[PDB]
């Protein structure tokens, strides 16, 4: 089932990829391609490397220069596409914690990494933020000040789910505190993109907190 | 997370292995071990070679002789262990169809297969039956006369699922007739074991038909 790419705002594109199988259904995962003129920035590589190659095709066929990718944590729906992009000399970005954590697992690692809780890419275009542990110890989010879109990755859950889902890496205890750190940025969010499922509004934050305290208590 | 093996009837054990999905959570997969004095029969291998190692150890730590396995269709949650069992000269069986589908896909093959719609293992202990396509073109079921258990594998869905699961290799329109054919055998079904989810009663068959007619439209 091949990659899908669609525009969700000027210079912002949603890519959805489909990994499946072995007696479970089809799972979808989302990331973005964010444009500043001809220059593209990828947020979370497609699951597989064959779909990541297609995403790179989508970009360059349209004459886009792919400046960098950013992964939102060490798990593979966000990552191991990092290997391919490295092989092409395209800068791959994560948090330091994430880079170290990928190394500990002997998995391929980004060539670039940022050190504190905040970091900006594209000269203003993409603001990254580590709010604390949640779905994973290292999950970050990305804020796009132009389109007023927050990419929540698996730190958040679309309205279509009713369970945080996977928590083996998680800190249900601390999840609620992390989303609140997000709400504290007071981003003027007009849209949230989850790692899985459907794009929605700012209300996805509240719904996520709804499920984090439901599972602590 | 490790295989679980639990007694569900005299001489019948449910083995359940787990795989963990991206932001969705834990998915389980069931098979059975059927004992006959101290001879043991594996109906579906666990979902991975390591969980298959653990099942064989469970058996042999109890003084059981693992006589054979049978796989209910060609997919991984049913056949992952086939390579391992082959390397220990444990006879492995599938239907003729399942075998040729595995060989077509470059996957290791059972060392034995049956040609007809009906077959038996363990000399009547395990009755097999191919009732037509459903979840796959090749799915078979296992009837256990003594315990009165029907192992329906992925041809059936337990009550807690309100979908049909992965349908990219399914025959949605033949699915209902195929369940119908199982009913026609007039097995005094006491428990239905699904490939995923909880063990139930013969209700599971009606539920499954329901879901199947539904998707048909
Ligand atoms: Mg199993
Ligand atoms: Zn299957
Ligand atoms: Zn994750």
Instruction: Give chain B positions within 8 Å (CB) of A19.
Output: 22
Any residues with CB less than 8 A from the CB of A36 and at least 6 apart, and which? A11, A122, A123, A125
- Residue B215 sits at the chain A interface (C-beta within 8 Å): no
DSSP string, A50-96: HHHHHHHHHHHHTT-EEEEEE-SSSSTTTSTTHHHHHHTT--EEEEH
Query: Which candidate from B75, B166, B195 shows the least CB-CB separation from A26?
Result: B166
- The four Cα atoms A111, A112, A113, A114 give a dihedral, to 10 degrees, of 170
Instruction: Give chain B positions within 8 Å (CB) of A195.
Output: 22-23
- Residue A158 sits at the chain B interface (C-beta within 8 Å): no
Query: Which candidate from A20, A76, A195 shows the least CB-CB separation from B166?
Result: A20
Contact B193, B199 (CB under 8 A): yes
Residue B74's closest chain A neighbor by CA? A22
Measured CA to CA, the distance from residue B133 to residue B117 in angstroms comes to 12
Give how far Cα B170 sits from Cα of A145, B27, B30, B174, Å: 45, 20, 19, 9
Distance A3 CA to ligand 2 centre (A): 23
Instruction: Give chain B positions within 8 Å (CB) of A163.
Output: 25
Helix, strand or coil for residue B152? strand
Helix residue ranges per DSSP H, B10-95:
49-61, 76-79, 82-86
Neighbours of A91 (CB within 10 A): 16
Method for structure elucidation: X-ray
The CA distance from B60 to the nearest CA of chain A, in Å, is 28
Please state the residue numbers annotated as binding site of A for Zn(2+): 22, 73, 75, 77, 135, 154, 196
The DSSP bridge partners found for residue A200 are A192
Q: Which helix (H) or strand (E) holds A194?
A: strand A191-194
Report the phi/psi class of residue B29: left, alpha or beta, with left for phi > 0 and alpha for psi in -120 to 50. Answer: beta
Please state the residue numbers annotated as binding site of A for Mg(2+): 15, 17, 95, 138
Inter-chain touch B26–A166, beta carbons under 8 Å: yes
Neighbours of B102 (CB within 10 A): 22
Instruction: Give chain A positions within 8 Å (CB) of B77.
Output: 22-23
The CA distance from A37 to the nearest CA of chain B, in Å, is 33
What number does CATH give the domain B1-217? 3.60.15.10
Instruction: Give chain B positions within 8 Å (CB) of A29.
Output: 22
Tokens of A176: 């609620």
Question: Which ligand is nearest the CA of A22, by number?
Answer: 2
Strand pairing class (A191-194; A149-153) = parallel
Give how far Cα B66 sits from Cα of A99, B40, B69, B154, B195, Å: 45, 5, 8, 24, 21
Residue A28's closest chain B neighbor by CA? B22
Tell which residue, B6, B33, B30, B35, has the closest CA to residue B19.
B30
Domain boundaries, chain B: 1-217
The CA distance from B41 to the nearest CA of chain A, in Å, is 22
Question: Which ligand is nearest the CA of A23, by number?
Answer: 2
Give how far Cα A155 sits from Cα of A166, A171, A206, B123, B213, Å: 11, 11, 12, 54, 37
Inter-chain touch A24–B27, beta carbons under 8 Å: yes
Residue A161's closest chain B neighbor by CA? B24
- Residue A166 sits at the chain B interface (C-beta within 8 Å): yes
Instruction: Give chain B positions within 8 Å (CB) of A196.
Output: 22-24
Contact A147, A12 (CB under 8 A): yes
Inter-chain touch A27–B24, beta carbons under 8 Å: yes
Contact B86, B80 (CB under 8 A): no
Tell me the torsion sign for CA atoms A102, A104, A105, A107.
Answer: positive
- Residue A2 sits at the chain B interface (C-beta within 8 Å): no
- Residue B105 sits at the chain A interface (C-beta within 8 Å): no
Residues in chain B: 217
Residue B80's closest chain A neighbor by CA? A22
């Amino acid at each position: 089932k091949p990659l899908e790419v669609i525009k969700i705002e000027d210079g912002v594109y949603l890519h959805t990829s489909f990994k499946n199988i072995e007696g479970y259904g089809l799972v979808d995962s989302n990331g973005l391609v964010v444009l500043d003129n001809n220059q593209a920035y990828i947020i979370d590589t497609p699951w597989s490397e064959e779909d990541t190659k297609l995403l790179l095709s989508w970009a360059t066929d349209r004459g886009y220069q792919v400046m960098a990718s950013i992964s939102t944590h060490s798990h593979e729906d966000r990552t191991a596409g990092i290997k391919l992009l490295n092989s092409k000399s395209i800068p791959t970005y994560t948090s330091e914690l994430t880079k170290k954590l990928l190394a500990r697992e002997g998995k391929p690692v980004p060539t670039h990494y940022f050190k504190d809780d905040e970091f900006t890419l594209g000269n203003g275009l993409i603001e990254l933020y580590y709010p604390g542990a949640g779905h994973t110890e290292d999950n970050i989010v990305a804020w796009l000040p132009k389109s007023k879109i927050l990419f929540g990755g698996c730190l958040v859950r679309s309205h279509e789910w009713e369970g945080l889902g996977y928590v083996g890496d998680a800190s249900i205890s601390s999840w609620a505190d992390s989303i609140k750190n997000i709400v504290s940025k007071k981003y003027p969010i007009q849209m949230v993109v989850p790692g899985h499922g459907k794009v929605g509004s700012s209300d996805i934050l509240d719904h996520t907190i709804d499920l984090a305290e439901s599972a602590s208590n």
